[PDB]
């Protein structure tokens, strides 16, 4: 899915989408393609444990420093443990192995923090009709998050803009400075252009996706 994403982005960036005689970004807006999942909160505690996050359906997840993941579903009981090599086990809180009690405890600590203390990104948006965090890194400018369903999210720290890239829909959601959420089909930005702000963010995305590919 990453290879596809990189190709979609390269293709948009090659068409010089901000350099058209008239840019019609609004023509590319596609509400069909609004994603199902995105990361609405996150906490990096990789100094000790890992990266905690919440997805827009209120499921919570941790990627542990040992590259394993534990996910609590929005029902508050179902878990999925994903091992370093991707192997999945389905469990519950009411009846878990004791071997996972540490990780479930940690999971509850992230859950309570995120619930007590953080704002839900895209909270006004209805997603369209569960993945885990494959990986993440932070640059000086942003945090990049790569989900197991192929989605890449990027959150830029200074201005608080976010991009959500989905290679399945070949679509991008931009959350701008005023907290407006607009979703675009990549093939139509290729046709009708976009503003320099979005075009700049997409050039950066292209770059971050080639970092994800060499790791």
Residue numbers in the entry: 373 to 501, 508 to 593
Paper text:
Furthermore, new peptidomimetics (699, 700, 701, 702, 703, 704, 705, and 706) that we developed according to the crystal structure of the complex of Plk1- PBD with Emi2, were introduced by microinjection into immature mouse oocytes, and the resulting in vitro maturation was analyzed. To identify the binding modes responsible for this strong activity, we tried to solve the structure of the complex of 103-8 with Plk1-PBD. Unfortunately, our attempts to crystallize the complex of 103-8 with Plk1-PBD were not successful. Instead, we obtained structure of the complex of PBD with peptidomimetic 702, which has a phenyl substituent that anchors bromide and methoxy groups at meta- and para-positions, respectively. The structure of the complex of Plk1-PBD with 702 is very similar to the previously solved structure of Plk1-PBD with 103-5; the latter peptidomimetic contains a hydroxy methyl group. The distance between Tyr417 and the oxygen atom of the methoxy group in 702 was found to be 4.7 Å. This finding could be attributed to the orientation of 702′s functional groups toward Tyr417. The subsequent hydrogen bonding between Tyr417 and the oxygen of the methoxy group in 702 determines the strong binding affinity.
One of CSFs, Emi2 (also known as F-box only protein 43) inhibits APC/C activity by binding to APC/C-cdc20; therefore, Emi2 blocks the ubiquitin-mediated proteolysis of MPF8910. Subsequently, the phosphorylated threonines in Emi2 can be recognized by Plk1, which undergoes phosphorylation, and these phosphorylated sites serve as a recognition site for SCF, another class of ubiquitin ligases; SCF destabilizes Emi2 and activates APC/C10. In this study, one of our aim was to elucidate recognition of Emi2 by the Polo-box domain (PBD) of Plk1 using X-ray crystallography and biochemical characterization. To elucidate the detailed molecular mechanism of recognition of Emi2 by Plk1-PBD, we determined structure of the complexes of PBD domain (367–603 of Plk1) with peptides Emi2146–177 or Emi2169–177.
